[PDB]
RNA sequence: UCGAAGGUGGGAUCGGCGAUUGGGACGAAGUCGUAACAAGGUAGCCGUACCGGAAGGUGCGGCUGGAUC
RNA sequence: ACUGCAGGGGAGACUGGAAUUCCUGGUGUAGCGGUGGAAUGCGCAGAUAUCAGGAGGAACACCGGUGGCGAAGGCGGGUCUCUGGGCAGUAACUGACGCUGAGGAGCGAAAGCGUGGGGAGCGAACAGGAUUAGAUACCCUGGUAGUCCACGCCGUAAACG
RNA sequence: CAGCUUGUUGGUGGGGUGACGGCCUACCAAGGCGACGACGGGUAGCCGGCCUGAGAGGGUGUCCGGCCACACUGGGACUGA
RNA sequence: CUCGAUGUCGGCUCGUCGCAUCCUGGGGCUGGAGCAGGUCCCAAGGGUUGGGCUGUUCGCCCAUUAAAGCGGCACGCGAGC
RNA sequence: AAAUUCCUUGUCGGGUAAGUUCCGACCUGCACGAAUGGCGUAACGACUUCUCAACUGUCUCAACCAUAGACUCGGCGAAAUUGCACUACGAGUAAAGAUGCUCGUUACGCGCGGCAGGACGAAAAGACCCCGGGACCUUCACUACAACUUGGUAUUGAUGUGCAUCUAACCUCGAACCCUGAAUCGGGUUUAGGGACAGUGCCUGGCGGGUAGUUUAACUGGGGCGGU
RNA sequence: GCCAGGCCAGUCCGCCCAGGGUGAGUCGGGACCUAAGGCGAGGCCGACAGGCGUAGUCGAUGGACAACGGGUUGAUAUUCCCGUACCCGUGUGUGGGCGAGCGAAGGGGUGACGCAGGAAGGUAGCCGUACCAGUCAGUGGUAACACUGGGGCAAGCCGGUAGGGAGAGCGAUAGGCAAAUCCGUCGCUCACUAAUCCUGAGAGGUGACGCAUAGCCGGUUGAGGCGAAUUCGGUGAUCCUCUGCUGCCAAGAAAAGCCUCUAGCGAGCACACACACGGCCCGUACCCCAAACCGACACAGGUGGUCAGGUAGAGCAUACCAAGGCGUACGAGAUAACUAUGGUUAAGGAACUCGGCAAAAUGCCCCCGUAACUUCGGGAGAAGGGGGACCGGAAUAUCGUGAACACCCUUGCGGUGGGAGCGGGAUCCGGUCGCAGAAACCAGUGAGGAGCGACUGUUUACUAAAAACACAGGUCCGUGCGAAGUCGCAAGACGAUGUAUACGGACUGACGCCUGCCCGGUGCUGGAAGGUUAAGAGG
RNA sequence: GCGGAGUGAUCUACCCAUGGCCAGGGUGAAGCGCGGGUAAGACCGCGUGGAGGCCCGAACCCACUUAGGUUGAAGACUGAG
RNA sequence: GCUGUGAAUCCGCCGGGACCACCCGGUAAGCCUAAAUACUCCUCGAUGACCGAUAGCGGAUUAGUACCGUGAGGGAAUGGU
């Protein structure tokens, strides 16, 4: 699924690309597309709050249904599998039998033209969105919501999946692809299956310019900065940074999760 | 940047950056306009 | 026109020497161990991998050209 | 060709239980572990032990054999799907179409290599303990690669009857 | 030493030779050799014979005799059967 | 002395001066037979090479030469490079 | 023997007539070494470095030509600088390098084109150095503070046995509805959760070059180092 | 006008003075639309100041939107005038038709979009040419189609070519906030191998019985008046078909507008033609690789976009020219040194020098040929060679491009052949000339060995372009989601309309082989048995 | 130099939205076809195709070297590369 | 002033410089209140052992003008027959 360019040039020596073999209809569905402009990592203040962003290809936002709440019982047909610049997963254009047009994250094994069910009575097939109550323990799921009706937020990048670990009383315990065991409410809904495009992590971008196309801007190491710019800066030759590694803002490496965050009650075991 | 000087005139940008309405939109700007009236500047 | 010799050039190929370096063989009554031959003192060998001054050690699989019931 | 026959022959998917390890809790207290003897180590912050639940990986006890199958290497938890070979019988068919095979091609234990997963237990390297004159070992305590999976590469074994 | 061959393989019309012949030439087609070893590298004059051996073989090619090649090294014509 | 500035090494260019003389010139002594030298004295008129290495000065080396002198002049000379 | 080797032009070999540079090694590594990566590496380099061919005025060693200036004439017409001035040289002397002082020597007055030795020429109140001040930078200098974090207490309640449960405070960027005509804002209502927790106030410990203000002596045959 | 200014002078002038001059329904903007962003009713947040932001409203560099050709002034012209158009709106008549018709809330569709690359059909332009009109240049020749000039014309409208675009209906309808006959989804019949409809470059007609033009007669050489021919080829776009087609991954605005639906409005309407009218505001002069802009200057600098012909050329290089500009503002002399910019140089050829710095050299097209090494792509234009001009012949169809008179067939911008003239390229053979055939201008030096950095890139504007930075790749750490991190006192925002194959931070820096030992110190992570301890409580 | 309050991104740094521009040569990736090869493939040869922080090279953007300028034509330029 | 806790209504409460007793003084947690005080952009009227055009206002004069700066800002010179 990954096609490697030949070393016809130093920028393509080890480079690779997705063969896009799963994609049909290289254009997006017009009614389902909304505009999107780059921010350069700038917030409302106009200042860089996320470094290393900017440039990058112009993009259009497709609306993905991370809810799948309002069409329980009405069936959908996977009309198309299509590129989406906004995520690493591919997207699936579903035609609902009531005539509604929808985009969803494309799981493994939802080739064009097959049927997706939603609701408590849905079959346990890749792409079917059900409550965790009706999803049995042990199956691989994705696009699972943290709160009932809040929309999918968990395991929705390419190749990601939760497995449902168990359901004791009213909370489903589940292993998050970070390896973290978390409990969510059983009425949180998830779509059955791994997220597709699982092989895109193997893409070797060949050159700097390609990451510039994807919108990443050059990152400068703190150790080649001056002391005024970075705690690691300074030194006559090259140094290791004259101190324990810290961020550009002097923050030491270490746990940054709020130790008294309210979600600790649902987090069962932190990642390894 | 060879040969290009610092002041490249553009009257619309002059007005939108230093203009009367820009001045009047903030207290500092109104303070400046009143200070220039008080000094007696012809141009405000 | 063809033409030997000659000239120019880049290759091919066969040799010599070469600071330095590597192993081999044969030598002596040298130094360090004792790896194999007995269950050789941890059975030994084969391939492979890693490690160790050195023989060697260990892992994985295999063999009996070893054992045990 | 037809009728039968035996089989761990192969591949894929799903799946079962014992056991080890770890986690959560219950009990419970000062040992546990290990050895030729110890120590390193684990525990007293609650270990070992014991009960319940759970996670995960690997291998499939009893059947099991001296046996069966496969060209060899090798092959067994179960089920399903696909699939190769072999043996017997009838004499229906072809009518020497056979044998071998330089080169060549494919398959080829284990180790190893690449990428991506996985990682219980074991365990090269490594580290400590012990033994010892020394101990780069054998023994102990840990333990990384690896062992497992997918796909390639390697193409070697006392690949032996 | 696994790819060697372009006048190379063949044909036509010519030329040329004592004579056939790519021997040479114009044109046309794209063939010829090779694992039975092409092409290449090394070595070598070959033979009846001589030495040895029971023979088959092995070594060798000196006297004699036969054949070939050469004549300081390399290239070319002349006369003349 | 100079900090309200006296530009630092080497090279180049141009020099100029001293003699403690490298050559050429004149001599004494010699452990000067001759050829060559050694040493000292007098002598500054002229001459006193081109390269390799090094930023170099210096130095070593190559090839020469009658000889390949030593020093000063803001370690002469950047309002000359 | 290195972008690292002081000794050092180490030693051996190669390249040159001759090689402190270069290449290959030796290992005696002043002071290499594995992601401040180690060792290699095809391709790439207006990088650094060494060699060869070609080529040439780079050079031996210069010559000539044209043009723009320079020069002359006419027109216009600045500048830095400037204590003066009918501003020699030698040997001296002197704040120790003299146009200006001494003793001599030399020199008719004035222009023009050139040169650049001096006027310690001009230019910038020396960047070096030291002293005083400052700035910024660093940190296990000092003292603070932000941020982060701890507990008490208020917000903050009920029931049982700190623990658990509850819901009503409070919280929700979960959902629906309404203001709303246009609203991914906001607010309200309902619901679904969380929940006396969290957050916040006051008090409090910690941490804190993230930030800030500062200090960091003097003597000294310059300062530093050493010593005092 | 000339006393300042203009680097001199000045009668001149972008200087001084006065007067004059800029004409739009269609051009560029507004009255239309929105992007980024700005402001922002209420609002949320914040001691105050204020921050942010919803509705909304602005905001072109983009979307939509109706005009062309010629003439004229001293100065404006797609603006004035002429000729011919097109767009929006208004009123009045006539004719016949329908009692439908309008629907702009909202829905839906469209609008609507990247990069790269052609090909084909064309066109502009250009080069010739039929034809037309002028000229006879006292030089050796040259009286005609030799030479010189011409060999033109739009928007609009009509017809509709090549090429492209499409299945057509019927029914249901859980979706598009209400509705929908629209859209979406689903289902069924016909045909498909076909016809039909739409769009439709170019070409044709009309515009044009007009305009323009070479030129001619007379002419303060002003202004006039007249005014020919305009055909057929070649070549050929940076333009059109083409918002197409193909390929690719990095996956490529919005809104209005337009169409359609229904909600709604509706007793009157739609439509045609004729006439008569209304079309607003702002800009419009002049300068624009500049003497009028940014550089204090009439300053060797900078300044976005459009057009941009000929010959040679691959070319928008270059050389010389066209159209069109200009000689641009100190001059005149003069063989000084010297400086600068160029040029040439015997013999030698790096001996120069820190260093081949600079210069020289190489240089083009085609054909041969091309090493170590390699990551199999490269290295490579490796290196190293050969040919190159003109003339003639091959050469009537040599060849390949484009495709006319006159013959044949489903009647057409149609087809079969046919080959004229017009261009292109290559070869071979012969000859000719020079010192030289790449002709001038233009236009790679090459090879070998190290170090560093893999590479393209980036950097100290104004002494450093590198070995520095970045980079793809690697690893570690953080982060379970208004995440972590960051900006903010907060609200809020970015992160991200992302969700661990993700995001942030750190170090390393393609790729290959690898990455050993140490957890003592200091950090970080986890643990909580005990010691220590603040406020609080206590008293 | 320190503080308070303001002014500046018409230069420059980065980013955002929306436009524009890049003569002419060259190389020849994927893919796609045909053929060979075997049973089928691998794979190979031809075409086609036109990729690439690809090559040469104008505009354009830079600023490596060098000479000139250095009271400049210019407070950073010019010539040649 | 903020945080916590949190009264009492005269046989109360507050002050008298920790605090206690006595004594003295006063009635917090509501508001309003002239005059004497401060100031002069501006209007009149005077004044000066004040200035007299480089002074006096920056400004006798185009004066916050010209000019400089993107901007905030800076900011002249010039009188006499
Ligand atoms: Mg703002
Ligand atoms: Mg980043
Ligand atoms: Mg730095
Ligand atoms: Mg900074
Ligand atoms: Mg710091
Ligand atoms: Mg540093
Ligand atoms: Mg260092
Ligand atoms: Mg040797
Ligand atoms: Mg032994
Ligand atoms: Mg052994
Ligand atoms: Mg032993
Ligand atoms: Mg043994
Ligand atoms: Mg072994
Ligand atoms: Mg071992
Ligand atoms: Mg074994
Ligand atoms: Mg089987
Ligand atoms: Mg179990
Ligand atoms: Mg575990
Ligand atoms: Mg336990
Ligand atoms: Mg247990
Ligand atoms: Mg038969
Ligand atoms: Mg064989
Ligand atoms: Mg195999
Ligand atoms: Mg294995
Ligand atoms: Mg592996
Ligand atoms: Mg390994
Ligand atoms: Mg792995
Ligand atoms: Mg062990
Ligand atoms: Mg050990
Ligand atoms: Mg498998
Ligand atoms: Mg073998
Ligand atoms: Mg075996
Ligand atoms: Mg022939
Ligand atoms: Mg013949
Ligand atoms: Mg014949
Ligand atoms: Mg011989
Ligand atoms: Mg015999
Ligand atoms: Mg013979
Ligand atoms: Mg003989
Ligand atoms: Mg002889
Ligand atoms: Mg004869
Ligand atoms: Mg002075
Ligand atoms: Mg003397
Ligand atoms: Mg003598
Ligand atoms: Mg002399
Ligand atoms: Mg004399
Ligand atoms: Mg040399
Ligand atoms: Mg001298
Ligand atoms: Mg000197
Ligand atoms: Mg000297
Ligand atoms: Mg000097
Ligand atoms: Mg001097
Ligand atoms: Mg070196
Ligand atoms: Mg050395
Ligand atoms: Mg070396
Ligand atoms: Mg390290
Ligand atoms: Mg490195
Ligand atoms: Mg570069
Ligand atoms: Mg001259
Ligand atoms: Mg003069
Ligand atoms: Mg004099
Ligand atoms: Mg003197
Ligand atoms: Mg004197
Ligand atoms: Mg005097
Ligand atoms: Mg003079
Ligand atoms: Mg001087
Ligand atoms: Mg001076
Ligand atoms: Mg000073
Ligand atoms: Mg610290
Ligand atoms: Mg707290
Ligand atoms: Mg609190
Ligand atoms: Mg500080
Ligand atoms: Mg202070
Ligand atoms: Mg001191
Ligand atoms: Mg001292
Ligand atoms: Mg005048
Ligand atoms: Mg004048
Ligand atoms: Mg408001
Ligand atoms: Mg706002
Ligand atoms: Mg807005
Ligand atoms: Mg607007
Ligand atoms: Mg616009
Ligand atoms: Mg005009
Ligand atoms: Mg008209
Ligand atoms: Mg779109
Ligand atoms: Mg074409
Ligand atoms: Mg004549
Ligand atoms: Mg003509
Ligand atoms: Mg429909
Ligand atoms: Mg037409
Ligand atoms: Mg044409
Ligand atoms: Mg005009
Ligand atoms: Mg100007
Ligand atoms: Mg000028
Ligand atoms: Mg100019
Ligand atoms: Mg040109
Ligand atoms: Mg002149
Ligand atoms: Mg010469
Ligand atoms: Mg010569
Ligand atoms: Mg030479
Ligand atoms: Mg030299
Ligand atoms: Mg040389
Ligand atoms: Mg020299
Ligand atoms: Mg050069
Ligand atoms: Mg040159
Ligand atoms: Mg090379
Ligand atoms: Mg070449
Ligand atoms: Mg010809
Ligand atoms: Mg010829
Ligand atoms: Mg000749
Ligand atoms: Mg680089
Ligand atoms: Mg390049
Ligand atoms: Mg610089
Ligand atoms: Mg530079
Ligand atoms: Mg990275
Ligand atoms: Mg991670
Ligand atoms: Mg946060
Ligand atoms: Mg780190
Ligand atoms: Mg680095
Ligand atoms: Mg390490
Ligand atoms: Mg520790
Ligand atoms: Mg300040
Ligand atoms: Mg501002
Ligand atoms: Mg800007
Ligand atoms: Mg701006
Ligand atoms: Mg091209
Ligand atoms: Mg291809
Ligand atoms: Mg490129
Ligand atoms: Mg252009
Ligand atoms: Mg430009
Ligand atoms: Mg730059
Ligand atoms: Mg220079
Ligand atoms: Mg240039
Ligand atoms: Mg009261
Ligand atoms: Mg009162
Ligand atoms: Mg009051
Ligand atoms: Mg009062
Ligand atoms: Mg008063
Ligand atoms: Mg008054
Ligand atoms: Mg005054
Ligand atoms: Mg101004």
From Swiss-Prot, chain A:
Disulfide bonds: none annotated. Gene3D superfamilies: 2.30.30.30, Nucleic acid-binding proteins, Ribosomal protein L2, domain 3. Keywords: Ribonucleoprotein, Ribosomal protein, RNA-binding, rRNA-binding. Residues 36-58 have a biased composition (Basic residues). One of its GO terms (molecular function) is transferase activity. GO terms for biological process: cytoplasmic translation. One of its GO terms (cellular component) is large ribosomal subunit. Pfam families: Ribosomal_L2, Ribosomal_L2_C. Part of the 50S ribosomal subunit. Forms a bridge to the 30S subunit in the 70S ribosome. Belongs to the universal ribosomal protein uL2 family. NCBIfam families: rplB_bact. This is Large ribosomal subunit protein uL2. The gene is rplB.
């Amino acid at each position: 699924a990954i096609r490697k360019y030949k070393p016809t040039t130093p920028g393509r020596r080890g480079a690779s690309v997705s063969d896009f073999a799963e994609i049909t209809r290289s254009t997006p569905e017009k009614s389902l597309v909304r505009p999107l402009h780059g921010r350069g990592g700038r917030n409302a203040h106009g200042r860089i709050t996320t470094r290393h962003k900017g440039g990058g290809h112009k993009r259009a936002y497709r609306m993905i249904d991370f809810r799948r709440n309002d069409k329980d019982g009405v069936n959908a047909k996977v009309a198309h599998i299509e590129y989406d610049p906004n995520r690493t997963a591919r997207i699936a254009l579903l035609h609902y039998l009531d005539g509604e047009k929808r985009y969803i994250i494309a799981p493994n094994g939802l080739s064009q033209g097959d049927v997706v069910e939603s609701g408590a009575n849905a079959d346990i097939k890749p792409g079917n969105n059900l409550p965790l109550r009706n999803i049995p323990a042990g199956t691989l799921i994705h696009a699972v919501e943290l709160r009932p009706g809040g929309g999918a937020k968990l395991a929705r990048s390419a190749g990601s999946s939760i497995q449902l670990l168990g359901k004791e009383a009213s909370y489903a315990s589940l292993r998050m692809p970070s390896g973290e065991i978390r409990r969510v409410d059983v009425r949180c809904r998830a779509t059955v299956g791994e997220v597709g495009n699982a092989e895109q992590a193997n893409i070797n971008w060949g050159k700097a310019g390609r990451m510039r196309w994807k919108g990443k801007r050059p990152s400068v190491r703190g150790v080649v900065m001056n002391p005024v710019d970075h705690p690691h800066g300074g030194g006559e030759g090259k140094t290791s940074g004259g101190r324990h590694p810290v961020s550009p803002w002097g923050k030491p490496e270490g746990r940054t999760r709020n130790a008294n965050k309210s979600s600790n009650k649902f987090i069962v075991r932190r990642r390894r | 940047t060879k040969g290009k000087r610092t002041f490249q005139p553009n009257n619309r940008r002059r007005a939108r950056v230093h203009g009367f309405r820009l001045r009047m939109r903030t207290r500092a700007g109104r303070s400046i306009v009143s200070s220039r009236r008080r000094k007696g500047r012809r141009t405000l």
